[PDB]
Each structure stands twice: as structure tokens, then as C-alpha cells.
Amino acid sequence: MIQEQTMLNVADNSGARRVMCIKVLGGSHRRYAGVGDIIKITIKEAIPRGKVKKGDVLKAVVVRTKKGVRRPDGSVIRFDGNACVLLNNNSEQPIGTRIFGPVTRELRSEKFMKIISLAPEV
Amino acid sequence: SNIIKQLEQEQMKQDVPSFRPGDTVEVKVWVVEGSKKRLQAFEGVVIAIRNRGLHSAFTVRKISNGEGVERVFQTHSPVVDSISVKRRGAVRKAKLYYLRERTGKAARIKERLN
Amino acid sequence: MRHRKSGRQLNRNSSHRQAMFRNMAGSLVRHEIIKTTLPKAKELRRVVEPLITLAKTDSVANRRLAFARTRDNEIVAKLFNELGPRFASRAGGYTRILKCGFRAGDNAPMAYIELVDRSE
Amino acid sequence: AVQQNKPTRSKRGMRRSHDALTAVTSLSVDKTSGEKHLRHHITADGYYRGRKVIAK
Amino acid sequence: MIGLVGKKVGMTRIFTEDGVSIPVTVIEVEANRVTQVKDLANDGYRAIQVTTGAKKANRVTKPEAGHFAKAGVEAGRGLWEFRLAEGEEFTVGQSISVELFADVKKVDVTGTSKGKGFAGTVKRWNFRTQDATHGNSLSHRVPGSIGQNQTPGKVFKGKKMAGQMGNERVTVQSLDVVRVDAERNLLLVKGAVPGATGSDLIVKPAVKA
RNA sequence: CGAUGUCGGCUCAUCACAUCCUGGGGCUGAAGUAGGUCCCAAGGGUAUGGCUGUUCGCCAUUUAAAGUGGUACGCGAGCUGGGUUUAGAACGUCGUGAGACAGUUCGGUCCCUAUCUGCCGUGGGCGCUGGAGAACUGAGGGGGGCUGCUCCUAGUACGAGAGGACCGGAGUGGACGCAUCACUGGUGUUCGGGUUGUCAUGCCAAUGGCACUGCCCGGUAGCUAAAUGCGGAAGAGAUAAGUGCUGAAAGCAUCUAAGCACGAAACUUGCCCCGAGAUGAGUUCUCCCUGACCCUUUAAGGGUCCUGAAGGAACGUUGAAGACGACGACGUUGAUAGGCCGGGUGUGUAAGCGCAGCGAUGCGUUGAGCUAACCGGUACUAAUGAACCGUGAGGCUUAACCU
RNA sequence: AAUUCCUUGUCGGGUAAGUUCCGACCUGCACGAAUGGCGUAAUGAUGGCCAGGCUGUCUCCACCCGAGACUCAGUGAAAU
RNA sequence: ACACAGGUGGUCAGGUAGAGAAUACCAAGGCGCUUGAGAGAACUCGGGUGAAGGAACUAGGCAAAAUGGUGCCGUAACUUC
RNA sequence: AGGACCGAACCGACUAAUGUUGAAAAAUUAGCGGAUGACUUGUGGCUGGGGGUGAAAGGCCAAUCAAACCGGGAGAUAGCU
After folding, report:
1. Number of domains forming the structure of chain D
2. Which nucleotides on strand G sit less than 7 A from a protein beta carbon?
3. Domain boundaries, position D28
């Protein structure tokens, strides 16, 4: 499950492709991540003109997990791989202009309505 | 145990169309999301059905659109608008656990040829 | 502990357990009397008592039956020839146990097996 | 380990006094003869509790 | 104020048309028929004795039938005594069933500890365990010392001991009540409760909200 | 020097304090955000990685705190053995040289059947001076106490801008102690199937074993988190500090002397939990036993024949209770357990047969046959009847009762 | 550096962080040509460092088939 | 030391699978051990099967596991050739 | 053609569990280095304690090693427990 050194995919365009977890970012003696949860991230695979540098340390929000979400009743819902969206370290919100897949409706519930306000359908 | 099965006679339902693992059931569903209660569809094959009575999951998976797209319809709970048993499989390993290792034409089930 | 296990242990491996009763069931049909310890005497009955009802019940592959378990072809020299329906007509209770215990200078739970009807 | 000389008989007998709990029950009369027999065990005639168990 | 005795008969999910399955414990009560009220000069306290099972007449003795003689003997599976208020109550013509909570939403459970043979440490108190690779001689399942090294004195009582399970209360301080049905002796409490199908199980009014 | 196994960590706690966070407040170069500091005070709490034996120090990113000490420089009949400190090898400096070097590098086999004390569970015995049986009271002594994020108060006071509140209220997650298999997964050699080699099988078929369950698929019942939940509350009482009111010493002034009301994570209850070897060995309810004779420097005992109540106890038939004992069910006035009948499940549609193919091998009969734990009917089988244990109203004091 | 005590030598690369690795410099207390010099193919129970495979060592351990331990009958010790 | 779980030169080399005295199932032939009945607790030891992560453990992937056969296709730098 | 090279026996005793009044004066278990050679092994013999024998370890030399076993000199000698 998502912890120290875990590699995640980027669900947004032209910033980065693959990025690494360094904190689950929730206080002391903490574990795991879920939909709409913040994570402390490092850039490991960059884009030739992308506006986030290789080896730099930033924040992201998680949008897909293979362990999935158990909050619904009866159905346990899992998602494609382990994917996140990059966050602006000085102006808040996501930095991408396009985001892949339809995503969950739970991404509105705190700070991340920008994600479903773009091309996603749920 | 029979003492809670005497209560299960006030929880389960017996009247169902005949279908087994590897069949298509093409259900119409709401998912209970959005104010206008928009009727939607589910696509895929049955991966679990019977024989736990009340606790028989009735699980369906899309299998041709990548990871996820899997839901539990509980056999008896009123959550479906229509159910249509269309395409028939042919199963001798009916758990369908090879669908966790195969993709495409190798994950497609024998055509029930006579 | 033993939170569901109700199967009888005998010391030694399970294939020895099954082989000892596969032999001693042949001895029981051959001599029609056997005396031995209670764990052996009771577990010997397993998969061979259901062959008494196999004289009366409607069946399929009747000669592959009584040979997929115990796997003996000398018990059928007497079973279904001089032993079957005259005990199925009683429904259960085909054999005695006569538990009396002990051996000469030694404690072991001895039982004395025979049919519920035996000429003297 | 250490043990001084020998265990006192006053404590050793006090540890023997629960070691087997052997009791007198006078035995019961057999249900076919004028003589006593061991509980749930066969008699010298090859009998038990009103029936024959072995041949003589 | 008083409690009720009523066995668990199994576990299930009760369902709603509102789209929640709701896990529950199933209980079936056979009522507790009352054998003594304690009042007037009874050593400075007031109480009620209920009895839950049933005992056969060829097993009941003359002094055992004498313990219930204020209303008559049925006995079986336990006694159970609860503290009572002033009110000058009769013992005869009384009986308690699930209607004791037919308007109460919050309950306190006392299930009693269950058989686990040796029980020991790992299956008892969730103590830590060690892998079998290289060294670690006979020290794979150790209690991290029960006491401490010499200077601070004798064994402290902060760490619990290893041993058999039984006679402990095993409380669950607050559960939700989903259904009561007085003329079916039916009770459905939310989620799981301590004990098993042979266990006897008590429910009492909650002291927390 | 007739031994005490010396580093640090791993693992796990307690006590002391000038309190890091938590509970209560004050002062400020305290708008706010904060930062700083002093008392009342030691109950609940008090970093994850990279380099380092680390002692230290450096670095990356976090927090309700990244507070201080004691403890054989805390834990070798616990874990580790990088360091200390031997035995092998070699290099550098010092000596003509063996040799020396907290010199340097890679390092280097390590004991055992807790006799005694303590502790859980539980037998045997002592105990209430008659026995037996079923239950409760609980004197008293412990446990457990800590939080972010979110929404609302509120982007309101304050503040180029950015930033931003204390008093309170609610929702939900983590940490921590337990619980449970309903749900979700793993397992599952007591159940079905596929399959390499070979044997058994008279031969072939279709079938059962063996080779590490041969290997590989499926798995009922049980068990268990990766699965799912409950819980550490607020009030009440009496107080320190502190807030004070009224009022002297000190015509004033003063929270203190008299008078007198408040008030904290501390104290004590409340929540949770044990407990009558509580020798302070308790009381609640109840059952049952009520004969002569011989003798004495005898109010103490022996000798003879009698004693059978209440209630226990050995062996059965047994149980997801259990190391042996203990403990639940049952014991013909019977369903305790096996067998039988049926309900229940798992596996994958066989055998044979007929159809299609040269054939491997399919398809129709066929969700075929074979098949674990659930739990109703059925005395078919099996629980020996007598017997065995246990005793005769129990010394003294006293209110009362019967006579 | 098998050589540098005095320091984790430094710059480049490797990682978010590199007392360790590779490359480069001379910025050697006492290196250097038989107390031998420079370097390489083959060989290895191979020192170390980078990346991958795959994994119950670890996240977090869970269940399982036997043999002792445990009970009785037989025989039957020691350090102290 | 012992009616010892060890060691000891030579000859034979059966059926099937296999390259094979690797290894397994069967012949000729030998054997089921000169103390047993059990009980179904940890703990200890030999051995198995594992979801989704992954070296994160530790001095160190030790230990364990995927790996592993040869038919054709394919194969860098370096070199004392 | 070959101190090539995989793999048993065969020669070893490197890894980890285990033993160290043991199955044993060093092997019980699975791996590991070498495996027609600077190989191993059955029989017979040769080299002898200031003397042997070592691809030579302060290794080994019949329980004995910076120097084996025995009796005698011998009741060496001890500013000492």
C-alpha cells in the first residue's frame, strides 16, 4: 500500500509522468492514502519543457488506487494503478490543463473541485 | 445455522432468471448519484452468483476496459430497473480467476458450441 | 484449542491410518470376528458401513462403487453374496462393540467386534 | 540448581498424598453370578452385564 | 435500571430499502421468570434474582429447589442478580423479556470471555512475534520482560499475564438497537458482541450517550 | 584478582523535575499570526528517512511535543554484536631487531534439563469446631485519562499586501486497549476435479494410491487482518494556585486576621475491573440426620451390636470446555453419540448409452456422478442393577420461643 | 592509496538525504621502478557501489500435515 | 564401551520412464526394527500454502522464493586470440 | 587435443539451523568448492622427539605440541596459597 518510496503515475498533462511518495502527510504514526487525500511528492520522471523540475519536492492529491475505496455499502470500488494530480506550491489548486479518466464524485468534498470541473464526467 | 435461516426466510428472494458465471446480464441501474436520478447501464460478465443465500454477492465485471468497473448487486436488494440475460458462456472452471491473468481474446470465454 | 477438528488421530501419518483400515476391513470380512482398541474398532467402520445400504439403494456404476475407497477385491467374495440386504432391512446398528477394556497386565481400551446376529 | 541434603518426609509424604488418589469402592456384584467384578470389564466366565462377550 | 439475559443465536445483515445492509447480532429470548426479590432487612441491600435456562426434575435436589422457594423452581444455566429500588414488589407473576428496551435506542453489553484452550500471549493480548532466520535462541515469543532488571524491585502490574480465558466480563459500553419485537421475544443489536452460540449474554441500560 | 561477563543500539518501562504538548492563568518590546517567560504541576502523551558503531555532528522531509534527568555509564540464564579486547592476513610509522602502536583494513565457534522465591490456571488439604447444596453481598484495592482534519461562529477584530483570532459547538479519521467472522481476502493433506512418471487394476477402458499434499486447480466448517466495529465522556463533591467579596492589625488601605463565595489534567467520586486466606475467612435462600448395653480414683474416654438422611462419588454414552484434574450435555422416568432416512453444501456434466468425427476429443440424456463439520425424524447400535461414599440434632454464652 | 595521523579532501555524476561508489585534480605526513613499475584477457564459495528480476527478511504475519512437550504402564541419571 | 542412527575390499548389475548406480514406481529378494496404549495445549522442531505492497529487514537479500530444460531465432564492450 | 566444463558417487567441511556428560573425541539436515586429476582408494613397506614430515599453518607426528608416549634420576626446585 502507498507509503515511503512508492512510485505513482501522474493523472494530469505535461508537468510529469512518474512521481515518488516521501510522506503520507497526516500527522504522526501515519499510514496510507485515498481519494481526495494530500501526499508529499518528488519528481522522478519529468517533461522536456515541463514547469516542475526533476528531483524537486512538492505536493499532490491521490485520484486512483488499486486497493480502492470501501466507503460504499456492498460494492468495493478499485481504480487503475496508483495515480495522483500535482498541486501548485504558491497559488493553490492543480497545475495541469487536462486530467485523464472519469474519476469519483468524492473529489469535490474538500478542496479539489477543479479536477472534475475540467474534462472528467463524474 | 438454521435458527438464523428461519430469519433468512424473511430476507432472501427465490424468483430469479437462470444465469451462471461467464454470462451477460446487461442490467439498468441508477447508482444513486445526481439530483435528477439518471438511469444508467452496466456492462460485463458475471464473476460470482449463488450459493450463500442472503450473502450471494451477484458480482459483474466489465473486463474489456482495463482495471476497475466491478460492482455487487446483492441478488435480493431492490437496486435494478431491468435485467436481461443475453450472451451465454461455457464454464468448467466457473470461479473465472484466469481473468486476473488474461487480457483480450484469451479472457473471452468459450462460445458454448454444439 | 481444537476449534473444529473432530477427526480421529491414531499416531503416525494419515496414509498409514487409511492403509491399516484398508487391511483390517479385509480381515473383518475374512474371519467375521476382530478384537482391537476402541479408536481402531470405531474408525474401521468408516466408508464400509455405507456398503450395506448399497445392496438396496438405486445406483450407477455399481462395481466401480465399493472399490474407489478401501479398494479391496477379496471383500466382494462375501459382500453382496452372503452379506448385505439382511442387515439393510434393520436400518443401522449392524455391528457390536462389546467394550470391556484392558489387556494382560496392560491398560488399552479393548473392544470385541461381531455382527448383530451371529450363530453359536 | 541446589537442594540441601534430603527432602523432609513431612513434605515428601504431603506431596505423595495427592499423587494417585487411590480409593476403595468394594466392587459391584456381577449381573449373572454370586461374585464381584470390575466396572465395565468382562468376567472370568466371558460375560458382562447380563450377556455373553467371549467363548470358553 | 435492571438487565436482561438472552443468548446470541447467530450473526447477519438486516437490510433497509434505503440502500444500507446494517450488520446485526441475532438474539432469541425465552424470558427470565423471577425467583426472589430481596427487600426488608436483607443485610442492608435490595435486589432481584431472575434465572434463564431450565433444569430437569431428576437433576434438581431438595436444597437447590430451596434456593428458588419464594416463587418455585425452574433454574438452569445461571442465577443472575440485579440491584433493585424501594417499591414493595412481589416475586410471583413476574417475568422479563425484550420489552425492557422496546423504547430504548442505546444499550450496554456484557458477553463474558470464551474458551481458547491455553490462550497464552499472542492469541490473548496481541503481543509481538519474531521470524525464525539466524540466532534469536528460544526468544521468538517473549513478553518484553514482565518485570524490570533488579534495581526498581518486584514485578509491576502494568503488563498482563499469560493464561486460560473465562470468568471475565468483556464489556462493550455502547451499541445501537435496530429492532425489538415483544410478542416474538426478538432483539437485534447493531454489529458483533462477545461470546458464541452456547454463551448466555446480558444487556443493560447504557450509562454513556 | 578465590570474576562483578565492560560500548552503544534493538526491545520495554518506571521514578525524579525548574513543563515540550495536554489542563488553569498572568506579564510583555502580548494588534494578529505568533515567537518569549513565570507559576499550580508530573496523571495522559512526548519523529520518519539519508550518511554515522555513534559519543557527536551533518543532511531530506514531518509533528499534538521533536522538554530534562535517574536507572550496575537501565534491560548478555532477552534481541543485536557495528564498537571494546585475544587467536588469521597485510600495510604505515618507531627500532639494528624480536617487538610496540584507542595504528589502519577485512574481521573472529560460545553452555544448561529453573532445584528455591514470585505469578496464572487448577487438583489435593486446612477453615468456620453437625453435615450438605444452590447463590449473593461486597469492607477494600486497582485500571483508564493525550489528538489532527473539516464545517459553522468568520475572512468578523487587527493588518501596504500576504496573513488572521481567542469564547465555543458539531461531523469524521488517526493513535491506543479490546471485540467479532456477519461482510471482504488468505488458509484449509477430513471433499470434488485436471495432470507428468509408474504401480495396482487379467488386458483395454475409467479409476485409486505412491514420488515433498508428486505437481496444479477449486473449497464446506473452523481460524485470522490485509477485513469490520465498540470504547477511553460530561457532570457532581471538596481544595491548592488564582479570582474575590465584606473587614482588622495599620482611624486610611488591604482577598485574611475573624467573617465568607468561587475555582485545575492534581485529590475524591462518576466510567471500567478484581475481591470473603476481607483468618475482619461475611449473609441470602434452603435441605436433612432426634438408639441401647458393659466398665472406670470419669463430666473424660474405651468396649459391644446397631446407624443410611440431605447429598456426593468410580466406570458409561459424549461436547468447537480441556495438558492431566476442573467444566457443559446425557445416562431408559433416554435421543448423549455412531448408523439409517431427509434437508444442507462443494466439485464440474463422469460412468455407460446414443449422436458427430479417420482420430484426439466433443455434444444430448446432464448443474451428471461423486461429496466434510449445518440439524429435524428414526431406539437399529450403545449408555449394568444392585452396589460405594456420606452418619445419629452437634461445647459454652444470651435475648426470645415451645414446655 | 592495503600508504593521508591532521578531515566525512574537493569538484562533477550518482539520492529527497551518499563518513560508502564511480570519474577527475595533486591539494603525497614517509608513493615509485626485482622490500620491483604500469595495466589487461581468462579464473573466483569474491570485497564494494548502480539499475532490474523475483521474493513471508520487511509492510503484517495468517492458516495448515506430522514428531517431542502433556497422560498412564515398563526401564531409568547429573551439575548442585 | 552398547544385540550402536557410523565405517568397511570385491562381484551382479532385472522391468518402465530418464542422459544417468540423478530420481521415482515395480522384480529376484528382503523388511515392517527384541517398550506399548495414547492425549490433540502452548512452547520447540522438520515441512507446506498465501491476497495487495516490496529490501523498506539486517552487518549483508542471510534465509527463502520466482528462476532453472534445449529446438530454432538472437547476443554489446573487452581480449594474453 | 584439453590441470576445459555441467552433474552424482568420490575427496572436502565453506553457508545457516543443530549438537559440544552428542547419533558421534565434528556429524544429524539441505545447500556449497573440486569431481579421469598437482585425484582418490585396498594391500605391503619406508622416514622417529633437538628427530621426522609439510604448495611450509608455530600445522601433524596413535586422547598428549612454541615441541608426543613411558619408567627412572625424583620426595628436582618453590623468599609462595
Report:
1. 1
2. 15-17, 57-68, 72-73, 78-80
3. 1-55
